[PDB]
């Protein structure tokens with residue numbers, strides 16, 4: 001049975017509204033993980049219960065090279081804890097922010113691994129990810145993609161089955177989500193389009209600080225590209241960012257296969273992508289197992305604390321979540 005005393009708390013990697021992620025060491029084993037610590041009360045107060053449970057289930061039910069592997073999930077009286085493999089390479093934003101733009105070859109590499117993962121979720125798990133934004137994309141110690149944060153996922157979506165919940169980050173929402181009249185799995189390909197656009201172009205495809213104007217742009221405004229962008233990259237992004245999902249690349253019965261067959265990915269052997277046989281164009285230059293150079297000093301400088309028998313307490317502000325007794329099979 002695993003508790004918070006089983007870990008040494010080393011460095012704060014990030015913190016937000018719902019809690020924080022801390023680099024930890026499991027004391028018995030000497031292994032290093034990223035622990036995401038959610039405050040139960042805040043989860044409840046902002047109606048994030050169903051999402052947090054979906055996150056837990058999807059993490060437990062999935063196995064893929066480019067999805068974060070869950071080692072443990074457990075709860076205290078006021079906290080939910082996810083212990084996953086540490087993404088040593090940091091967020092894609094860390095690198096994109098500083099380098100402005102990724103090469104087309106680098107973006108192609110990251111795109112391939114995202115497609116591989118999303119194809120797995122769609123085809124094998126009947127899952128639509130729904131939250132494909134730059135922020136959720138990280139890099140492991142080797143420079144391979146890790147998709148994180150599965151709380152917005154929709155389970156049991158088979159073929160052309162629809163979904164209704166309006167969810168996701170404003171700048172990343174598909175036109176059909178904004179229309180609020182049902183959407184399908186192709187919203188994930190819209191997200192691939194937005195994320196690959198950021199990588200290659202250095203900004204969002206659509207932006208306004210007023211949300212209503214932003215949504216007008218996403219719905220109505222035709223996509224434009226910096227004029228340095230190659231023809232194949234422009235074609236893929238145009239296909240991925242079609243407003244009408246039925247006209248969108250990956251929006252048909254073939255799903256991911258249509259994107260896999262696109263000329264931008266020519267020569268890409270897709271089993272080799274899965275097997276990580278493609279050498280990442282950027283290898284993270286971490287010098288130790290606790291090196292956090294790819295996380296903002298803003299977070300890593302901060303002190304770690306114990307707040308910012310109760311093992312059966314089930315209240316309305318702090319509920320006893322089910323399926324938080326997980327330890328990955330050795």
Ligand SMILES: CCOCCN(C[C@@H](O)CN1CCC[C@@]2(CCN(c3ncnc4ccccc34)C2)C1)S(=O)(=O)c1c(C)cccc1C
Nearest residue numbers: 013014015016017018019020021034048084086087135148
């Ligand atoms: C109910 C909605 O809750 C939404 C929860 N929140 C979203 C984060 O998960 C976003 N995440 C996007 C990718 C980067 C990381 C920061 C560090 N981190 C990881 N760092 C290293 N290895 C990993 C391995 C696996 C997973 C994460 C990591 C995740 C945060 S947040 O805004 O509250 C928050 C923020 C904004 C920062 C840190 C903790 C929380 C809880």
